[PDB]
Amino acid sequence: PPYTIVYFPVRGRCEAMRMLLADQGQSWKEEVVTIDTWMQGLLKPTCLYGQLPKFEDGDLTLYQSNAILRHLGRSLGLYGKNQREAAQMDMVNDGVEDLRGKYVTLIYTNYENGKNDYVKALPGHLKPFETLLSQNQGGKAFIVGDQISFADYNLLDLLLIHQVLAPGCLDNFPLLSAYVARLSARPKIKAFLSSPEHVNRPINGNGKQ
Amino acid sequence: PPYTIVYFPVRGRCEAMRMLLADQGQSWKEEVVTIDTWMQGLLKPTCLYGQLPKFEDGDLTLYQSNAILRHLGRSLGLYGKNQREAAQMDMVNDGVEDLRGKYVTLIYTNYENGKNDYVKALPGHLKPFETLLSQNQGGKAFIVGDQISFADYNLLDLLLIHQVLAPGCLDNFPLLSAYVARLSARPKIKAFLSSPEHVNRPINGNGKQ
Numbered sequence: 001p002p003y004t005i006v007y008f009p010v011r012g013r014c015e016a017m018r019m020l021l022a023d024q025g026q027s028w029k030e031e032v033v034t035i036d037t038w039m040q041g042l043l044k045p046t047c048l049y050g051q052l053p054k055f056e057d058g059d060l061t062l063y064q065s066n067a068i069l070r071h072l073g074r075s076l077g078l079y080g081k082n083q084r085e086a087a088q089m090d091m092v093n094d095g096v097e098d099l100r101g102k103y104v105t106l107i108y109t110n111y112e113n114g115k116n117d118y119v120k121a122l123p124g125h126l127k128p129f130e131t132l133l134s135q136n137q138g139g140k141a142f143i144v145g146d147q148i149s150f151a152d153y154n155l156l157d158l159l160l161i162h163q164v165l166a167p168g169c170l171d172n173f174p175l176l177s178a179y180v181a182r183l184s185a186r187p188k189i190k191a192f193l194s195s196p197e198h199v200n201r202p203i204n205g206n207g208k209q
Numbered sequence: 210p211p212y213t214i215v216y217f218p219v220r221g222r223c224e225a226m227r228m229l230l231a232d233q234g235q236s237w238k239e240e241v242v243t244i245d246t247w248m249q250g251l252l253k254p255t256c257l258y259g260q261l262p263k264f265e266d267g268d269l270t271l272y273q274s275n276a277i278l279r280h281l282g283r284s285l286g287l288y289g290k291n292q293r294e295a296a297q298m299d300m301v302n303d304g305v306e307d308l309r310g311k312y313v314t315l316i317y318t319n320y321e322n323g324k325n326d327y328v329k330a331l332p333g334h335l336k337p338f339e340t341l342l343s344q345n346q347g348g349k350a351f352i353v354g355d356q357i358s359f360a361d362y363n364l365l366d367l368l369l370i371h372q373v374l375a376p377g378c379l380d381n382f383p384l385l386s387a388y389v390a391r392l393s394a395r396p397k398i399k400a401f402l403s404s405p406e407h408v409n410r411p412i413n414g415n416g417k418q
């Protein structure tokens with residue numbers, strides 16, 4: 001520490017890392033970049049890949065949202081108890097990221113026309129996570145193992161924004177419905193989810209959700 | 210171990226993990242799935258996210274090409290000396306994946322009409338890796354730290370397929386050109402790159418490159 005998140009004023013690719021920090025009792029500084037500032041063109045060329053989020057952990061400046069999530073999982077002890085679990089958490093997080101990539105293309109590129117067929121295809125994309133939960137202690141614990149990991153925060157975020165996009169999307173997925181309810185009830189996640197900083201923040205940059 | 214890779218008969222998302230295993234003196238079994246077998250639809254339902262590669266390490270089965278690379282990096286000690294190094298290696302590997310995703314889209318969906326544009330844009334996508342090498346020992350060693358990591362094999366593969374797509378794309382990048390030459394001359398990678406198994410395997414599934 002100290003932690004600083006530098007990002008556009010939306011939830012986007014930073015809400016899972018914000019919930020992880022909040023749940024782990026950490027505080028962070030939020031450095032909000034408006035689109036007007038971004039378009040001035042002074043910040044982008046200092047960003048490694050020209051994009052945000054940018055994250056500072058003391059001395060270390062990181063780019064790439066999943067690299068920042070894996071860093072926090074490693075440093076705060078949220079990456080499993082052995083190599084087998086760590087491997088399974090990476091497999092889960094990469095599946096989360098692939099669906100997040102599709103969700104972002106829908107939202108920014110083809111919301112009006114694409115929404116119907118996306119929501120239709122969504123059960124096929126949610127089914128892997130339901131199967132992983134049934135394989136792990138019958139769905140009663142976390143996505144991998146017995147303790148929360150960086151992968152749980154990213155999957156919870158993905159499921160929460162999907163419930164806004166398609167309200168009944170988890171009705172046929174009992175373990176995933178219960179999981180979302182269970183993790184949302186964690187004292188510090190519930191407090192974060194009710195915070196005005198979270199509530200006032202739009203999910204995406206273009207008003208679609 | 211034992212190690213088995215289950216994939217289509219192409220280089221695609223498996224050539225970097227094959228170069229990693231070869232360079233670390235490991236042997237593995239290739240289970241080849243043809244397009245015609247895949248189309249029959251009996252194996253796809255058994256894959257967690259309905260896709261390949263599938264990788265077996267002893268009794269651990271894994272999916273997602275980058276979760277397989279991170280697993281091999283962690284179990285074979287190619288993931289840095291400390292936490293700062295591990296986070297930088299994830300940042301590099303996520304930047305490689307981003308450009309790999311762009312490359313895949315060009316090849317499979319818009320090769321004839323998008324090639325010129327892609328190649329015009331490519332210097333701006335390669336410049337971060339040139340910059341990362343110059344900050345690491347003036348570009349004389351690996352991409353992060355002083356030992357090879359899983360991320361080096363993935364960056365090496367990406368650069369090699371881009372030299373086929375746009376011959377001379379590394380002309381203006383002296384540290385990346387030197388880097389490709391240095392890693393390609395490592396005797397076990399050198400052997401692998403001239404092996405008929407590698408040479409006879411198409412880069413992609415549609416015959417474009």
Ligand SMILES: N[C@@H](CCC(=O)N[C@@H](CSCc1ccc([N+](=O)[O-])cc1)C(=O)NCC(=O)O)C(=O)O
Pocket residue numbers: 008009010012013035044050051052053063064065066204205206303307
């Ligand atoms: N792989 C990177 C991808 C980062 C990414 O796509 N960054 C976007 C922001 S998230 C998507 C997004 C876009 C716009 C807004 N907005 O409020 O205007 C919000 C979120 C960006 O920096 N775009 C600026 C640019 O490319 O110039 C990661 O995972 O961190």
Ligand SMILES: N[C@@H](CCC(=O)N[C@@H](CSCc1ccc([N+](=O)[O-])cc1)C(=O)NCC(=O)O)C(=O)O
Pocket residue numbers: 094098217218219221222244253259260261262272273274275413414415
């Ligand atoms: N995120 C996953 C992405 C996996 C992926 O794109 N898999 C493709 C193969 S790699 C790209 C590719 C596509 C086609 C061929 N081919 O020979 O026909 C080869 C490679 C696939 O299984 N496609 C089959 C399906 O979805 O039904 C990863 O990183 O592992």
